[PDB]
Automatic annotation (TrEMBL), chains A, F:
Subcellular location: Membrane
Residues of the full protein shown: 24 to 63 of 94
Family per record: Belongs to the FXYD family.
Protein name per UniProt: FXYD domain-containing ion transport regulator
Species: Squalus acanthias
Transmembrane feature ranges: 13-38
Automatic annotation (TrEMBL), chain B:
Transmembrane segments: 2-26, 32-49
Protein name: Sodium/potassium-transporting ATPase subunit alpha
Family designation: Belongs to the cation transport ATPase (P-type) (TC 3.A.3) family. Type IIC subfamily.
Residue numbers binding Mg(2+) 1: 45
Native species: Squalus acanthias
Cell compartment(s), UniProt: Cell membrane
TrEMBL record, chains C, E:
Pfam families: Na_K-ATPase
Claim: Transmembrane helix is one of the keywords in the record: yes
GO molecular function annotation: ATPase activator activity
Phylogenetic placement of the source organism: Eukaryota, Metazoa, Chordata, Craniata, Vertebrata
Biological process (GO), any one: potassium ion import across plasma membrane
Function (record text): This is the non-catalytic component of the active enzyme, which catalyzes the hydrolysis of ATP coupled with the exchange of Na(+) and K(+) ions across the plasma membrane.
Protein name as catalogued: Sodium/potassium-transporting ATPase subunit beta
Gene giving rise to this polypeptide: atp1b1
Chain segments annotated as coiled-coil in the UniProt record: none
Membrane-traversing stretches: 26-51
GO cellular component terms listed in the entry, alphabetical order: sodium:potassium-exchanging ATPase complex
Automatic annotation (TrEMBL), chain D:
Spans traversing the lipid bilayer: 70-93, 134-153, 174-191, 206-222
Full-protein positions shown: 785 to 1028 of 1028
Cellular compartments annotated: Cell membrane
Name of the protein in its database record: Sodium/potassium-transporting ATPase subunit alpha
Positions bound to Mg(2+) 5: 3, 7, 32
Length: 40, 49, 294, 244, 294, 40
């Protein structure tokens, strides 16, 4: 480390947003499944 | 009956903190923001529907 | 109704209940709220145990350092009359508040101050961010270094005859190493002359192309006579590990300023781990609206 | 009603204690007009608990729809716990970035000052105005998510008024869909790009989302034991004090 | 070693620590164990709130009722000399303990006792298992019903001249309705005569085929003169809802018993919700080893 | 209910044992899977 410790000030918000969206999508689908499960 | 109760706690909190804001030296553009936040906080904007 | 629901004398009720009801409800709420308070306090104590005293866990919201100044402008405007003295008082009181911390009387002895190179130098690492070695040592920064803006000669600092000063300062960040631009063919125009690697350059200019002509001679004062910050004052170890620490400063005199006209002056620092933001107008650069109306 | 307290308290502490604003107005409208609508709508599909066609008709002059017992529950007990959970997540977000709880009391005058580009934190760092504002907004986002987390246990303890959850049962598919959608919406509002230009909500770090969980489980256990003494002690204190 | 680790006088240590260590450890353990106790108590209180006072949640380990008797036999053996009186004292003291609860003085008034049919009858339902109606009412069971074994005439009950008695009893079960076998072509040999539907039959015999001859005349005494239990004494509502409740009893006199020889007598009840077990020798039936050695 | 309340004294231990064994078997398999997952 030392002088080139630039990583100590970086965060991968991109990957975090991607995962959080995948998860939101999954939860939304599961929801729909439960809602329509019975009407078919 | 409940719009009466809800409004009771809304005015009680509002008129009181507005007088408090100026008893502590708050300027006008800050107190207006307060008043708004308190009114929205107390009113259940989605109930009746 | 009105009177009864307030006080009846047969059931000995007040507002609706008797003395034993108000007492049971009050006792219940006191015990309930007491438990609530104790639980919140316990969950906050475990939080005090989860953090370190020598370093902030997250340092991403403060990665690109800011660029502040000594005068306190309400709307980033410096307007004052050269005749009426009660016009630049709010400014001087601030300038003075800032420089009043670099007094030599404060900086004395071996502890905790250390004499450093009178000429810009490289970084200095006083170890890690631990308590093993005692209170680290910070370099001394003398007032006099700033030549015409020090309040030691002309207390007012310039504002008295149409020649105000502006003390710029880099925002203190823990473990932040300033990195200047290298000598390669790509570098701004301005920066070519006087490339002291060890100095972070600061250079002011005019926001609009027109205003160029109306702005006169920007005279910068600093460590070694350069218009920048010496790398030897870095990195910063934090308050806990370096109390009594002084950050470099750079004075800027706006000599030959046109009278009775609003001038927009944008100052900017250059460097690798320095990046500006179109939303935050204080990240790396800063704007000032000077108007010496007399 | 229960979620009104965690929205009223941040403002009240903002004036009494002088701490940075915990819950903005846009976040409120995003709570009462967004995440709480579907669950409240689902609460209608609830089946009977006992026999309704057996009790006598309700008296209009004495029994009402909104009495003081409900106020004592929503405004007095559940809402209080939800507000405490929100403040918890708040202090956690600020403590992790550098602003410890001892230095937050009294900072508002300068925390809101638009011309102070040097605000010292508990460790000595200098924060510009926009930098500290970004953190306050991220605290609003986490406060809203904490509200949703405690609303989970509130929708479950509100499902039944007397009976237990292990008796009635989670046969209401709409309520389940409400919980799932309520969570998906909060994640969408925080993780979608460009939400810092429209609603002012920044992404959260995966360790924060777990600051409201203990409060929710506690709410569930408290209401569960509440709905128990009523069943064993008919006509007692818990009934004439907390039985809606 | 031996002496030092026990008491040194320079560091003022006992067993190894000073007075402040023993005090901090003791205080910690006291607080820790106190919290442990309070938590266990809370988790047990919620358990007291999870059960009902008028009915056991699980009643499957007591579905097939047992068949006990009045004498207390150590190994299910009744051995006593007709000469030495201090031989059958341990038996009589028990028999007496059992019958001492059916004293008429105890059964008096309208509450909580009620006069029931002197002849076997059907079930009687005093409502549900609630507290709405007060303490339910149980039927009276007179001593005298048992004719030669009542301790009212011959206190000893038989043991005095080679003619002991054995008071059988059906294990009390909450909400248990006894169901006797119906008159259809399939029924044991014994049960055919005197089929009072309302009576649960009890019939004793010999374990081995040989012993038949050596066992004389089994004379049963009971309600109505039948060898069974009247269905009117059921069901049982539990202690809480029926304190002062008496269960029917059946006396059995083993007249004409061969002298100086171990006789194995197995008694058995017959009925629908009655089932025996090869492991539990007291489920529905019972065994006795009588030996009147004189 | 009433006289024929015999069900109040019955428990389907058979079905319980069947399910408890199915579950035990599943847990055992999962265990083996985790143990050998990596050596192939
Ligand atoms: C049962 C099985 C279920 C399976 C379902 C599968 C569904 C399909 C699979 C995945 C769909 C998810 C789409 C992923 C899109 C990711 C976009 C992304 O990661 O973008 C990130 C970047 C913005 O980053 P930044 O640098 O500005 O960050 C700020 C940095 N600072 C502020 C510090 C300077 O994007 C950009 O630049 C460009 C963005 C361009 C616009 C993209 C539009 C995305 C918006 C909505 C789609 C999501 C809907 C999900 C469903 C939810 C239902 C409620
Ligand atoms: C009706 C709705 C009510 C809503 C409740 C909102 C709760 C918040 C209310 C006020 C917040 C004030 C700010 C709290 C900060 C207290 C400061 C404090 O206390 O600093 C002492 C210690 C810190 O020590 P240090 O030096 O190691 O830290 C740093 C050491 N360095 C920096 C040198 C390394 O902090 C500690 O120990 C932990 C102390 C944490 C403070 C918790 C106090 C909360 C008081 C009551 C809450 C209960 C509410 C129940 C509902 C009642 C309704 C009537
Ligand atoms: C540390 C973290 C703290 C978090 C605190 C907040 C927790 C709140 C969230 C979830 C709480 C779950 C509570 C579990 C309760 C289970 C109760 C249960 O199982 O009672 C069994 C019932 C009773 O049946 P019975 O005898 O009346 O049937 C008679 C049938 N006849 C008529 C044919 C004979 O059976 C039934 O209800 C039928 C089967 C229903 C199965 C329901 C399964 C779904 C459960 C939860 C959904 C998950 C929500 C997650 C939300 C997060 C979104 C991201
Ligand atoms: C059963 C039924 C199921 C139905 C499910 C429906 C789910 C729908 C799922 C996704 C649709 C989401 C809408 C897509 C929005 C795309 C926005 C976008 O692609 O933005 C990209 C650019 C960002 O560019 P940049 O990174 O260079 O900016 C740098 C800015 N700097 C540097 C100054 C900080 O945007 C900008 O610039 C300006 C940003 C404009 C803001 C638009 C956001 C709209 C706001 C609120 C509407 C959300 C309501 C919730 C509806 C829920 C439905 C379930
Ligand atoms: C179960 C159903 C779920 C779906 C419901 C949705 C959930 C949310 C519900 C209500 C949210 C309402 C909150 C209102 C917030 C307004 C925020 C606002 O206005 O912030 C002002 C900003 C500031 O912009 P600037 O000038 O600095 O930009 C400069 C750009 N430069 C410089 C780059 C050019 O302006 C902007 O963001 C301009 C864009 C304006 C955004 C309007 C968003 C309206 C949101 C909801 C209305 C529809 C809800 C109907 C659903 C009812 C459910 C029952
Ligand atoms: C009955 C109702 C059922 C309801 C089911 C709902 C379905 C749930 C759906 C999804 C949840 C799984 C999420 C997994 C996501 C992992 C993704 C991942 O890669 O994430 C890594 C982070 C670590 O982040 P970092 O900051 O360290 O690094 C940041 C480094 N950078 C930023 C530089 C890149 O980790 C994380 O987010 C940790 C993710 C959270 C861990 C899951 C904890 C589960 C909690 C309780 C369940 C226990 C069940 C027990 C079974 C009982 C059976 C009877
Ligand atoms: C009735 C109420 C129910 C409440 C349920 C709450 C569930 C909470 C769920 C997850 C907890 C949050 C995740 C924590 C992640 C922390 C990540 C991290 O960065 O951690 C680091 C710190 C340690 O920092 P240091 O300075 O000591 O390192 C010194 C290092 N050197 C020695 C090299 C200098 O770690 C720490 O503080 C760890 C300390 C955490 C202690 C709290 C334990 C939480 C309790 C249960 C968790 C749930 C698991 C079981 C789920 C059961 C489902 C039924
Ligand atoms: C070193 C290892 C230690 C291991 C600890 C083993 C724990 C067990 C030790 C002794 C067990 C004794 C039996 C406990 C029963 C207590 C009886 C009692 O108390 O009956 C009062 C109430 C019941 O009232 P009721 O009339 O409504 O019930 C029935 C009402 N009917 C029937 C009329 C409807 O019972 C109540 O309230 C709740 C009282 C429950 C009793 C908990 C007392 C345990 C005492 C200390 C444990 C802490 C150990 C910490 C480790 C220390 C190491 C030195
Ligand atoms: C990370 C580590 C993962 C570890 C995963 C391990 C895998 C677990 C594997 C199997 C567990 C599922 C078992 C389901 C069995 C149901 C079978 C059933 O039909 O059973 C019915 C009984 C009701 O019996 P009874 O006496 O009423 O009737 C007796 C009536 N007679 C006797 C007359 C017939 O019910 C029951 O046994 C209830 C069964 C227990 C209910 C499951 C509770 C799950 C607890 C926590 C998990 C929460 C996860 C949340 C998600 C977070 C995601 C981020
Ligand atoms: C990833 C996918 C994984 C899939 C794996 C699938 C594995 C294959 C699928 C199922 C295998 C399970 C076998 C099921 C056998 C059930 C046997 C059963 O239900 O029997 C119950 C009855 C005994 O009832 P009772 O009336 O005497 O009760 C006492 C009543 N009282 C005491 C009140 C009078 O049986 C009897 O009569 C006759 C019993 C005859 C002997 C059967 C031998 C069973 C013994 C061991 C096999 C289980 C091994 C499972 C693996 C575990 C690994 C550690
Ligand atoms: C189950 C519930 C009611 C238990 C709540 C226990 C409460 C009262 C306990 C839990 C944790 C405790 C605190 C934890 C840490 C400290 C710091 C220490 O230097 C002084 C005591 C003090 C301030 C404690 C005071 C009492 C406290 C808040
Ligand atoms: C977090 C930990 C330390 C909290 C433990 C709290 C303990 C001390 C509390 C929890 C539940 C409480 C008990 C719950 C029920 C009863 C029955 C009541 O008729 C008298 C009080 C009594 C006997 C309480 C005594 C104190 C008790 C055991
Ligand atoms: C990782 C952690 C939290 C998982 C904990 C899983 C626990 C709750 C699981 C593991 C094994 C499970 C049990 C295993 C066997 C049986 C017997 C079956 O006839 C009914 C379900 C029942 C009673 C299960 C209930 C839930 C159980 C105890
Ligand atoms: K509201």
């Amino acid at each position: 480390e030392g002088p080139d410790n630039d990583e100590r000030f970086t965060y991968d918000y991109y990957r975090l947003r991607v995962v959080g969206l995948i998860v939101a999508a999954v939860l939304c689908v599961i929801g729909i499944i439960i809602l329509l499960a019975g009407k078919c | 009956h409940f719009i009466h109760i809800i409004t009771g706690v809304a005015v009680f909190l509002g008129v009181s903190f507005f007088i408090l804001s100026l008893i502590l030296g708050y300027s006008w553009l800050e107190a207006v923001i307060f008043l708004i936040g308190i009114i929205v906080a107390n009113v259940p904007e989605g109930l009746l529907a | 109704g009105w009177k009864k629901f307030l006080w009846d004398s047969e059931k000995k009720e007040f507002l609706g209940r008797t003395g034993s009801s108000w007492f049971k409800i009050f006792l219940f709420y006191l015990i309930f709220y007491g438990c609530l308070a104790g639980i919140f306090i316990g969950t906050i104590q475990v939080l005090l145990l989860t953090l370190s005293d020598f370093e902030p866990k997250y340092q991403d919201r403060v990665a690109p350092p800011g660029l502040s100044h000594a005068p306190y402008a309400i709307k980033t405007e410096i307007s004052f009359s050269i005749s009426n003295p009660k016009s630049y008082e709010s400014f001087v009181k601030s300038m003075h508040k800032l420089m009043d911390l670099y007094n030599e009387s404060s900086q004395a002895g071996n502890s905790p101050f250390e004499d450093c190179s009178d000429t810009p130098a490289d970084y200095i690492k006083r170890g890690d961010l631990d308590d093993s070695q005692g209170q680290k040592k910070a370099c001394r920064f003398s007032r006099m270094w700033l030549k015409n803006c020090s309040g030691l000669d002309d207390t007012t600092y310039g504002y008295a005859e149409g020649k105000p000063c502006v003390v710029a300062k880099l925002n203190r960040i823990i473990g932040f190493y300033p990195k200047p631009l290298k000598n390669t063919t790509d570098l701004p125009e301005e920066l070519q002359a006087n490339y002291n690697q060890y100095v972070l350059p600061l250079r002011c200019a005019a926001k609009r192309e027109e205003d160029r002509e109306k702005i006169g001679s920007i005279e910068y004062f600093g460590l070694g006579g350069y218009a920048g910050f010496p790398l030897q004052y870095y990195p910063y170890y934090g308050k806990r590990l370096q109390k009594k620490y002084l950050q470099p400063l750079l004075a800027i005199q706006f000599t030959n300023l046109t009278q009775n006209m609003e001038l927009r002056i944008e100052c900017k620092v250059y460097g690798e781990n320095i990046d500006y933001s179109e939303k935050d107008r204080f990240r790396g650069r800063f704007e000032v609206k000077i108007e010496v109306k007399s | 009603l229960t979620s009104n307290i965690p929205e009223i308290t941040p403002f009240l502490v903002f004036i009494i204690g002088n701490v940075p604003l915990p819950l903005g107005t846009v976040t409120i409208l995003c709570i009462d007009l967004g995440t709480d609508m579907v669950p409240a709508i689902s609460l209608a599909y609830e089946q009977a608990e006992s026999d309704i066609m057996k009790r006598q008709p309700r008296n209009p002059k004495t029994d009402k729809l909104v009495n003081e017992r409900l106020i004592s529950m929503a405004y007095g007990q559940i809402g209080m716990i939800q507000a405490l959970g929100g403040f918890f997540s708040y202090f956690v977000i600020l403590a992790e970035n550098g602003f410890l709880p001892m230095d937050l009391i009294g900072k508002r005058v300068r925390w809101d000052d638009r011309w102070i580009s040097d605000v010292e934190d508990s460790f000595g760092q200098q924060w510009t105005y926009e930098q500290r504002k970004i953190v306050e907004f991220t605290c609003h986002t986490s406060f809203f998510i904490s509200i949703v987390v405690v609303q989970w246990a509130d929708l479950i303890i509100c499902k039944t008024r007397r009976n237990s959850i292990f008796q009635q049962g989670m046969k209401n598919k709409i309520l389940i869909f409400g919980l799932f959608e309520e969570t998906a919406l909060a994640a969408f509002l925080s993780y979608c790009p460009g939400t810092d230009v429209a609603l002012r909500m920044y992404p959260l770090k995966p360790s924060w989302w777990f600051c409201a969980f203990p409060y929710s489980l506690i709410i569930f256990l408290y209401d569960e034991m509440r709905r128990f003494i009523i069943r064993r002690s008919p006509g007692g204190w818990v009934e004439q004090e907390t039985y809606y």
